[PDB]
Design an enzyme around this catalytic site. Structure first.
Site, PDB file in Angstrom:
ATOM      1  N   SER A  90       5.572   5.803  -8.006  1.00 57.83           N
ATOM      2  CA  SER A  90       4.827   5.429  -6.801  1.00 57.83           C
ATOM      3  C   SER A  90       4.226   4.050  -7.030  1.00 57.83           C
ATOM      4  O   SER A  90       3.454   3.857  -7.966  1.00 57.83           O
ATOM      5  CB  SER A  90       3.712   6.434  -6.512  1.00 57.83           C
ATOM      6  OG  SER A  90       2.957   6.047  -5.375  1.00 57.83           O
ATOM      7  N   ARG A  91       4.571   3.098  -6.166  1.00 53.12           N
ATOM      8  CA  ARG A  91       4.148   1.703  -6.333  1.00 53.12           C
ATOM      9  C   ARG A  91       2.678   1.456  -5.975  1.00 53.12           C
ATOM     10  O   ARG A  91       2.123   0.426  -6.359  1.00 53.12           O
ATOM     11  CB  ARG A  91       5.065   0.766  -5.535  1.00 53.12           C
ATOM     12  CG  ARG A  91       6.517   0.845  -5.985  1.00 53.12           C
ATOM     13  CD  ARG A  91       7.306  -0.425  -5.708  1.00 53.12           C
ATOM     14  NE  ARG A  91       8.754  -0.216  -5.631  1.00 53.12           N
ATOM     15  CZ  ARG A  91       9.583   0.016  -6.652  1.00 53.12           C
ATOM     16  NH1 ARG A  91       9.138   0.082  -7.907  1.00 53.12           N
ATOM     17  NH2 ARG A  91      10.884   0.193  -6.403  1.00 53.12           N
TER      18      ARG A  91
END
Lengths: 246, 66, 146, 274, 120, 273, 114, 118
Positions: free
Chosen positions: D105-106
């Protein structure tokens, strides 16, 4: 098709590297435990030399006790000991190897001379009891002999595993060489050694023989274990570089 | 009853009994280190038939079988 | 061309070399005396010109250095190889420090093996149990007082 | 969107039938633009325009774990990371089969709740060391790391309170003496039942698991906080000691037919309900 | 004879994949002897060409059909097991192999005598 | 048809030159249909239309053992199985180089003769266990290895000469005979005969020189009260005399010009079955 | 029961890569028993079909749903650990497994005596 | 100077594999000193960024080209062998290294005096 299979070939080598790296790293731990020895060593078999150190060089049974590895991938080590057995091979010969590879290799190559072999699972360290078990089996079904030779792997350096040997003459032949040394200017290195030993009683001289024989074997197996883990480190790290190049 | 020598049992087996006794008297804090220089963990055998090792059973191995 | 033997790689008041299994505990350390026991009582090893082989029973050593300090051990068996020069090599099978042994566990182990003596397998197996008791009695003795 | 793979195939049909020049894997030039303008309309608006949101969960089917396909590689480059589902983990047992190493997850840290950020920051350190040590003797990370893997298995979704407490227990090391196979039975008895109240050593003034309304107090203050820390660590101490004494004692016992099978059917049903 | 060379080389390519994975020491006793012969077969298949004197730096070798069949036949039998491997590399028939093996024995004898000169 | 690979290339030329849209590997859309309508015309007709037949043996060349090619994969999906010829088996020694694991017949059991079905049903069980045990000596390991030696042949064998040499290996007449001397054993069975040679013959009808027994075997099979006892005499005489008189030489001959004479004898025995 | 077959076969494929590299003897005590069961699971999944009597050379087997679940359940428990591996290959339910295992015991007893 | 940093770090990666197998004590006398310098080279290569004051919690450092070459040159010579390792971690230029080393000497003197009492 080709996109999937070349990936699955590559995934194969990835699992290969990980499993072979587990052997590498596990044998480092054993090599660290095993090198706790090189600092000590040698001084334990000072008076073992005066008993059994032959200068050089078949009528009644010559026993041979080659110390081999359990599982393979050690490299030029089990093959090295097979060359020593193939070079000597007299008419009067009998083999009692030590290790699973020795049991498997000498049984097929020499079905006539091979009696049986000893196995150690390498769970505990190489101890006197293991060395006595070797010496006592070396004359049990194999019985009396002229001498008991013990082929093993010396460890001088991490890269260099030297191939060495211990010669143990039989008690009848040993006492005759000892009597010569005691009452002659010949030998010289063991003039007062033989006199001091023969002054003691007959059981003591026989127990001195048994003791230093087991002590000579104890060094050989322990030295082979140290050679085993070192040579395998080079072979496994060679295997990894082969896997990485693929 | 008394004489270990007169009931067979060579000098080397006596030493193994003597060491194994000396290891059994070691302090609780550091007995693991000493037991690994004694505890039996080996056998003698040969392959016969097809992948079926015999196990010879001649040299006792364990302490109580001496 | 031929095989080099295993002894070729080893090299080499009193100075002893006390070892166990295949590793020294002391290496040619200068010392006033050492006192073994075996066969012919407790022949204390001193500086001399004798040359003598002495077999060992389950018994303690006591390494007294020239200054005054003392370091005691306990032995299972082996030999003591005295030389013409002021030096010996006490090659034991096991040489525990007289400190790593326990007084309470040893006396507990004495009581255990005496019971096994009564209900032994036979007269061959019963002699082996007497070796075990012969060590334990010597172990407890070396701890107490001396 | 379930799924964008089949949308692309439908758009390719339209483009090819109308003689639009095809490129990689026969898709048109603007097949990237197709998914890009779709997913960019999903966003988090400013305070100046209501502060509303459209969260996007695009699904994209891969053929034999091949991320190098054109439609898959396009959607990865647009989205804010992915949740990779491995086929070997699915058949292996872990369900949902979330490959944590491949997944990412960025904007993870800023997205989490204050309470969830506290526990999860440590879990990254534990599972990193567990995965490394599993490849190459049990450490504290090795024990606690293995229990997290057992806890991640679930059919239906867990409530925020029931999840974070069972993870907090494993973090501080309440499931160390509890074996790996009995983690789901331990977690079930924590959520639905309660051992402290089960006539005896209770005496907690507010914190219990039957009271589902504490969920929103935990989200505000977190577990590591002077309000709930001491009260929570009672609940878990009562649950562990009673579970180990009364409930886990059966496993040394039960070595018979019709009881080993009864133990299995109990433990298998515990995987479903968190 | 020609089929045995093709058969031996087919076994050798299978064994070459095993050595890369496991190792040279891991092979069996009979398979090691096949590798020693097969390695010599690959080397003996090389030939210095008469047009390529500039490249190789050695004179060419026209190898007769009777020479080719007999030399390869003996190698398969194991008559040239004690002959070293590099003797077979880049030569013609068996006379040139034994000639190079004689030169290798003589040069190895000289270099060994140089390292044996110094003592103590 | 030798071969359909070159037919497809010729059809591709025709299609491409006349502007037919190409697809996979530049072949037209109907290159499957080309081989399908060809091979389907080969069939076994009913009793109502004569009961005649056209058997098809289409050949299809593969490039470096790649079955995933478009023309090869098409023809495999049409035909009733295949006979795969491996390049490594060819160079290895086995000729014909029939890869039995890769090869398959979709209507094998019903197609065979009653006699051939008897022996061959067991061979599938033996070679299955031999191939597994070779990867990972039993009776299957001994007898399995002899079958592999027997399968090597240049020219085609007659039905009688084949089935008897396979029946010998099935019931275990070549167990004491070594693997290298199976072709010399098989040659001396077919052309020569050891019972009639030395002395101990005394069979009333069953011999190998009488080629007309071929059609009696096809009717009654070997496992049958008519031929079973008479056949097992022939093989017992052949084995005992071969082991005693002929195989005794191989323990002896360990010299130059006799080892080579043994080889040249055994190599020529591979050709004649 | 069905999930345990899928789980055991997944572990078996991971163990199959380890035996190829290291060896069969190198595995743990519990993992060896998983291999013995998993090898039997792969063999027991085979079945001689009734239409394929010509191919297999053996009569077909319709295995009931109750038979299928119970026989596989017992194999996972380890109730058929002493049953040999080739007994499970190409048979129906547990009655045919124990029937083939009886035939294997009898024929092995005869060949050993001879 | 730049090549010597690359050379020393290449030797350090080879020595790092030897310490894992054998041990730190098993290395030679000169190789131990290479490890002490190379460990400091890896630490001295770190730098607290001026935009990342919020992250690091320390003020930034613009290190001049003349400062960068001279400070690394002296470290390779062995002029800063007696300087501790953590002095080099997350600083910019030799003045900041010696400043942090002064603070480390003073704080280590205080904490040692506390345990030389209790």
């Amino acid at each position: 098709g080709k996109l999937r299979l070349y990936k699955e070939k590559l995934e194969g080598y990835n699992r290969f590297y990980s499993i072979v790296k587990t052997i590498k790293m596990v044998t480092l731990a054993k090599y660290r435990a095993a090198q706790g020895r090189i600092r000590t060593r040698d001084f334990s078999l000072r008076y073992t030399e005066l008993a059994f150190s032959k200068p050089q060089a078949a009528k009644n049974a010559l026993v041979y006790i080659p110390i081999t590895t359990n599982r393979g991938s050690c490299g030029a080590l089990n093959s090295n000991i097979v060359r020593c057995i193939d070079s000597v091979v007299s008419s009067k010969m009998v083999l009692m190897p030590v290790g699973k590879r020795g049991i498997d290799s000498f049984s097929k190559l020499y079905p006539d001379e091979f009696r049986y072999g000893i196995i150690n699972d390498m769970k505990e360290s190489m101890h006197f009891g293991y060395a006595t078990f070797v010496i006592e089996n070396a004359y049990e079904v194999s019985k009396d002999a002229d001498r008991y030779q013990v082929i093993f792997n010396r460890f001088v350096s991490a890269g260099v595993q030297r191939n060495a040997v211990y010669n143990i003459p039989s008690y009848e032949k040993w006492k005759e060489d000892l009597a010569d040394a005691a009452s002659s200017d010949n030998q010289k290195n063991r003039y007062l050694f033989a006199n001091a030993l023969q002054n003691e009683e007959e059981q003591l001289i026989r127990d001195f023989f048994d003791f230093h024989a087991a002590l000579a074997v104890l060094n050989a197996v322990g030295e082979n274990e140290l050679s085993e883990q070192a040579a395998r480190l080079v072979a496994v790290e060679g295997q990894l570089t082969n896997i990485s190049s693929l | 009853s008394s004489s270990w020598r007169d009931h067979g049992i060579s000098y080397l087996k006596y030493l193994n009994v003597c060491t194994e006794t000396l290891h059994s008297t070691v302090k609780e804090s550091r007995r693991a280190k000493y037991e690994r220089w004694s505890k039996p963990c080996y056998t003698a055998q040969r392959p016969d038939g097809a992948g079926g090792q015999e196990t010879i059973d001649k040299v006792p191995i364990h302490t109580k079988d001496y | 061309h031929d095989l080099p033997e295993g002894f070729e790689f080893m090299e080499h008041t009193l100075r002893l070399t006390l070892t166990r299994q295949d590793e020294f505990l002391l290496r040619e350390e200068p010392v006033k005396c050492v006192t073994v026991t075996g066969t012919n009582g407790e022949y204390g090893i001193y500086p001399g010109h004798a040359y003598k082989i002495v077999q060992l029973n389950p018994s303690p050593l006591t390494v007294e250095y020239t200054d005054g300090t003392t370091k005691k051990y306990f032995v299972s068996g082996g030999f003591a190889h005295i030389n013409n020069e002021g030096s010996c090599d006490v090659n034991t099978v096991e040489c525990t420090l007289l400190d790593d042994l326990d007084l309470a566990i040893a006396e507990k182990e004495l009581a255990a093996q005496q019971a096994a003596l009564g209900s032994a397998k036979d007269d061959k197996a019963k002699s082996v149990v007497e070796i075990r008791i012969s060590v334990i009695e010597a172990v407890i003795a070396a701890l107490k007082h001396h | 969107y379930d799924d964008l793979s089949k949308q692309a195939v439908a758009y390719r049909q339209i483009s090819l039938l109308l003689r639009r020049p095809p490129g990689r894997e026969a898709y048109p030039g603007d097949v990237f633009y197709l998914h890009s303008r779709l997913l960019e309309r999903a966003a988090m608006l400013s305070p100046g325009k209501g502060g509303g949101s459209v969260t996007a969960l695009p699904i994209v089917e891969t053929l034999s774990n091949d991320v190098t396909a054109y439609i898959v590689t396009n959607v990865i480059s647009i989205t804010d990371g992915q949740i990779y589902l491995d086929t070997k983990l699915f058949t292996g047992g872990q369900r949902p089969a979330v490959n944590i190493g491949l997944s990412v997850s960025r904007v993870g840290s800023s997205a989490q709740n204050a309470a969830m950020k506290g526990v999860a920051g440590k879990l990254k350190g534990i599972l990193a060391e567990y995965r490394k040590l599993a490849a190459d003797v049990q450490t504290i990370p090795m024990i606690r790391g293995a229990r997290f893997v057992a806890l991640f298995n679930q059919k239906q979704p867990s409530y925020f309170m029931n999840a974070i407490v069972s993870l907090y227990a494993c973090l501080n090391g309440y499931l160390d003496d509890v074996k790996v196979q009995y983690v789901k039975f331990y977690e079930y008895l924590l959520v639905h039942r309660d051992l402290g109240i089960m006539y005896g050593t209770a005496k907690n003034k507010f914190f219990y698991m039957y009271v589902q309304e504490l969920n929103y107090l935990i989200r505000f203050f977190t577990l590591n906080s002077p309000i709930l820390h001491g009260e929570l660590e009672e609940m878990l101490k009562q649950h562990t000691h009673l579970f180990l004494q009364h409930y886990q004692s059966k496993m040394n016992a039960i070595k018979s037919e019709k009881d080993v099978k009864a133990l299995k059917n109990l433990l298998y049903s515990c995987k479903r309900a968190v | 004879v020609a089929q045995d060379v093709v058969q031996m080389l087919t076994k050798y390519r299978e064994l070459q994949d095993i050595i890369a994975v496991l190792g040279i020491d891991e092979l069996s006793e009979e398979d090691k002897l096949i590798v020693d012969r097969a390695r010599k077969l690959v080397k003996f298949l090389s030939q210095p060409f008469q047009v390529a004197e500039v490249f190789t730096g050695m004179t060419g070798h026209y190898v007769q059909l009777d020479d080719t069949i007999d030399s390869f036949s003996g190698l398969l039998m194991g008559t040239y097991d004690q002959v070293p491997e590099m003797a077979f590399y880049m030569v013609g028939g068996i006379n040139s192999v034994l000639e190079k093996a004689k030169k290798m024995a003589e040069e190895a004898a000289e270099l060994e005598k140089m390292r044996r000169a110094r003592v103590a």
